[PDB]
Amino acid sequence: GHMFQCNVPLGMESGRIANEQISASSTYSDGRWTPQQSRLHGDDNGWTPNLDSNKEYLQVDLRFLTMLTAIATQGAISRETQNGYYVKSYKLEVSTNGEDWMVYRHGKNHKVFQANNDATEVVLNKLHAPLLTRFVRIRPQTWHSGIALRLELFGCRV
């Protein structure tokens, strides 16, 4: 029989991750691109900051120490305009306490994750080693048209 593998989805899309555990640095002012709309395969836009820049981030609080192995991301098609948006690359920030934040590194420099080439398909990125964290931040670095984000995290809880 199949043994357990640390690579299960942690709650986005599912629901195990509550609306209250998702937040952002900001959000688009019209209210139609909130952080709660960044769940993978959501059909109501996604998350968009108030200003498109590489200082914005989407944040998820796992509420418990958790093994984190991979991140999946999509852009989003605007429900209102049929326009497509997506993040093309991002950095990852993690934290056990929500105040001391480490930018994920590969070697001496920040790992820059390559992300999406369209607004519909899922791009999965694995970490080169599972990381034990409670807070995760996705901070885009490049994007097509504008930042728009749907997300899933993979792992297991200790």
Binding site: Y28, D30, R32, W33, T48, S78, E80, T81, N83, G146
Partner: peptide
């Protein structure tokens, strides 16, 4: 009338 995102 507000260009929509």
């Amino acid at each position: 009338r507000k260009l929509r995102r």
